[PDB]
Amino acid sequence: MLFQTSYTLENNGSVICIPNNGQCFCLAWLKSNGTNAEKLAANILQWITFALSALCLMFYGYCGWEEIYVATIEMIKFIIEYFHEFDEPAVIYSSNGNKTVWLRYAEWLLTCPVILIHLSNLTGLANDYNKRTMGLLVSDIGTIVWGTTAALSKGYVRVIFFLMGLCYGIYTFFNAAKVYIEAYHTVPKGRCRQVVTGMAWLFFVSWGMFPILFILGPEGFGVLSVYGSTVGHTIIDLMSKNCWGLLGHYLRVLIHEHILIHGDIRKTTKLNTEIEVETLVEDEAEAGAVSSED
Amino acid sequence: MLFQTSYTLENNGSVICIPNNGQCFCLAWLKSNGTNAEKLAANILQWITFALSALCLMFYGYCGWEEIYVATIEMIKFIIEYFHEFDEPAVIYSSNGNKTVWLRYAEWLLTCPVILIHLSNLTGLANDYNKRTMGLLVSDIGTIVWGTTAALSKGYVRVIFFLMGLCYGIYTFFNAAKVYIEAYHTVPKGRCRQVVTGMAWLFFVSWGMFPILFILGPEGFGVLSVYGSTVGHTIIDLMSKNCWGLLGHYLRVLIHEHILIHGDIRKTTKLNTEIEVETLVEDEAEAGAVSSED
Numbered sequence: 001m002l003f004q005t006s007y008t009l010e011n012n013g014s015v016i017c018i019p020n021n022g023q024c025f026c027l028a029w030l031k032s033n034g035t036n037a038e039k040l041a042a043n044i045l046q047w048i049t050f051a052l053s054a055l056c057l058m059f060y061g062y063c064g065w066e067e068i069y070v071a072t073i074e075m076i077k078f079i080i081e082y083f084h085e086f087d088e089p090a091v092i093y094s095s096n097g098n099k100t101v102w103l104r105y106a107e108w109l110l111t112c113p114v115i116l117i118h119l120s121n122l123t124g125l126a127n128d129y130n131k132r133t134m135g136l137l138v139s140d141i142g143t144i145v146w147g148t149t150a151a152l153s154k155g156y157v158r159v160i161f162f163l164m165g166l167c168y169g170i171y172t173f174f175n176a177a178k179v180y181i182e183a184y185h186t187v188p189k190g191r192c193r194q195v196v197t198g199m200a201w202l203f204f205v206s207w208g209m210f211p212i213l214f215i216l217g218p219e220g221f222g223v224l225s226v227y228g229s230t231v232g233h234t235i236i237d238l239m240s241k242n243c244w245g246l247l248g249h250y251l252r253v254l255i256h257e258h259i260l261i262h263g264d265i266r267k268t269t270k271l272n273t274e275i276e277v278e279t280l281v282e283d284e285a286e287a288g289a290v291s292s293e294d
Numbered sequence: 295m296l297f298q299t300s301y302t303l304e305n306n307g308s309v310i311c312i313p314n315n316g317q318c319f320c321l322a323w324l325k326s327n328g329t330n331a332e333k334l335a336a337n338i339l340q341w342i343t344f345a346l347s348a349l350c351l352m353f354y355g356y357c358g359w360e361e362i363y364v365a366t367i368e369m370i371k372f373i374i375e376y377f378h379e380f381d382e383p384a385v386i387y388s389s390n391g392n393k394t395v396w397l398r399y400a401e402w403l404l405t406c407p408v409i410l411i412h413l414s415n416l417t418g419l420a421n422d423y424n425k426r427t428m429g430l431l432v433s434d435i436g437t438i439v440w441g442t443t444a445a446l447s448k449g450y451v452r453v454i455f456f457l458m459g460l461c462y463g464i465y466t467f468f469n470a471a472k473v474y475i476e477a478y479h480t481v482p483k484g485r486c487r488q489v490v491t492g493m494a495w496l497f498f499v500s501w502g503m504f505p506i507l508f509i510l511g512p513e514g515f516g517v518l519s520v521y522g523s524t525v526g527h528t529i530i531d532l533m534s535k536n537c538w539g540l541l542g543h544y545l546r547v548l549i550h551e552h553i554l555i556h557g558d559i560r561k562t563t564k565l566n567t568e569i570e571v572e573t574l575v576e577d578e579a580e581a582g583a584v585s586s587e588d
């Protein structure tokens with residue numbers, strides 16, 4: 001540690017004395033991060049993630065910028081974890097006694113908006129983004145900022161900022177859901193609709209797990225230890241980023257093959273909220289005005 | 295303060311003893327935030343900003359969501375400053391001795407992307423955003439994340455993260471410049487082109503001042519004190535947000551009046567990098583294919 005770890009209790013445990021060496025001191029910081037079993041598990045999941053993220057980068061290496069940016073950051077993340085995981089400021093040890101994993105929240109700020117940009121162009125064919133895309137990004141940034149602030153805070157201050165994060169988060173989840181519904185009815189009828197369905201399940205489950213891990217972790221009720229929280233977070237990271245990004249590359253190849261073999265043939269379908277989506281079709285026998293009541 | 299402020303030096307200044315009351319302690323945290331003159335100046339500029347931001351909200355209150363979101367956050371910001379400016383986590387007092395103004399960086403994360411979204415639709419007429427818009431947002435988020443990490447860090451770690459912020463920042467500034475060039479040649483020939491020119495000056499000067507205030511502040515070489523840094527930051531905040539947002543509302547009204555009186559009549563002008571922009575014109579005697587060599 002690069003904070004003070006050696007001290008003496010004096011006067012029946014009522015006074016703590018430390019070397020006057022300029023280092024900060026706090027008992028709360030010295031609480032254990034967890035068991036050796038938790039530590040072993042965390043280093044394994046990290047290695048798996050560093051390696052798999054590096055494989056994904058090379059694999060994608062065989063437009064497309066979103067999968068690479070996230071996979072690059074994940075890799076960079078491990079080297080910092082690997083060398084300085086518990087060094088400030090990968091973990092912030094603050095005057096109120098909290099341990100805040102800035103690396104995680106910073107990583108979310110780097111990667112989550114890019115995932116949402118990817119989500120807004122699942123097929124990869126669009127060159128533009130609507131107004132709703134922008135709201136998705138702004139709501140998600142706020143979620144992380146409130147969540148980070150909550151983690152840095154204590155008591156009632158933590159609770160309030162968490163709840164604003166929850167309000168921002170619901171708005172994010174709701175609009176993400178809207179995007180996936182449009183995407184499902186946009187992509188061709190076969191395999192493309194299977195992949196999109198898989199991504200929705202992956203997305204809502206993995207992203208939905210995050211507020212739960214927060215509540216359980218040191219940032220909340222301290223059920224999970226620091227290592228415990230790391231293991232959980234790396235799991236849902238693999239889901240939310242690596243696996244989801246894999247599917248996204250796969251989905252985009254499938255969309256590309258469809259347009260190469262069949263061309264870009266569109267049919268307008270309307271979904272009655274009442275939304276309209278231009279579905280990709282396979283042959284020119286369809287170019288009509290189809291609908292679908294929900 | 296809610297950290298330890300009372301201590302005794304023992305053994306010829308080599309041992310510090312504190313009450314064992316659970317509070318964290320560090321000498322670095324107790325350095326003064328600055329002179330009383332600096333404090334007075336900071337409270338004045340904050341009040342000016344709280345009031346003026348509230349005026350802007352009501353004033354805009356007489357599409358348009360970007361001016362309100364930023365002005366709302368600025369207002370909320372002051373109430374937190376007003377009650378808990380130097381309470382954790384508005385300022386983070388970390389184990390490495392740094393004081394990091396999380397409120398500022400968090401505020402930047404909330405407001406700067408929205409300013410850039412505004413910038414990407416200065417006229418307010420567009421319903422879509424290109425790929426380049428998305429890069430603008432992603433580069434800017436990275437800047438803040440690296441800058442925040444640099445502020446939280448020390449020594450060579452601070453320097454590296456600052457430089458990545460600088461690389462991200464240049465990419466942001468460059469693309470912002472691209473947007474303003476397109477915007478200038480898009481808006482009508484008269485007053486609209488004056489306002490856009492004003493915004494470019496405001497934008498690059500106020501945003502450009504931020505890395506400079508960083509280098510001078512406690513986050514860098516400690517030339518400026520904490521209060522000193524606050525005063526500077528509130529000034530360029532008024533420029534980057536309040537004044538710029540004012541012009542943006544004004545610019546959008548002017549664009550709206552043009553389309554109401556004259557309708558939406560466009561002419562394609564091409565700018566030889568070679569870029570094409572559809573300029574708004576006043577009468578149907580222009581609908582041609584004009585160009586302009588740079």
Ligand SMILES: CCCCCCCC/C=C/CCCCCCCC(=O)OC[C@H](O)CO
Pocket residue numbers: 154155156158159162166169170173208211212215219220221
């Ligand atoms: C994400 C979109 C779908 C929403 C589903 C969300 C997942 C579960 C959240 C649940 C209830 C909120 C719980 C609020 C309590 C949190 C307060 C806290 O963290 O505890 C602080 C306290 O000071 C320490 O003792």
Ligand SMILES: CCCCCCCC/C=C/CCCCCCCC(=O)OC[C@H](O)CO
Pocket residue numbers: 448449450452453456460463464467502505506509513514515
């Ligand atoms: C923003 C786009 C246009 C670019 C214009 C930028 C404005 C000026 C930046 C300049 C040089 C960079 C200076 C790099 C030195 C910073 C390192 C530092 O902060 O000092 C840490 C040290 O450890 C404490 O003693």
Ligand SMILES: *C/C=C(C)/C=C/C=C(C)/C=C/C1=C(C)CCCC1(C)C
Pocket residue numbers: 108111112143144146147148162165166169170207208210211212214237240241
């Ligand atoms: C790669 C990392 C990802 C996809 C992280 C996602 C994180 C979230 C969806 C976090 C959500 C939260 C809330 C819904 C409420 C406030 C607490 C948070 C930040 C954990």
Ligand SMILES: *C/C=C(C)/C=C/C=C(C)/C=C/C1=C(C)CCCC1(C)C
Pocket residue numbers: 402405406437438440441442456459460463464501502504505506508531534535
């Ligand atoms: C309302 C707040 C605004 C507009 C803040 C803008 C901040 C910046 C443009 C900061 C830029 C930085 C760099 C260019 C390099 C790294 C250090 C920063 C974060 C100060």
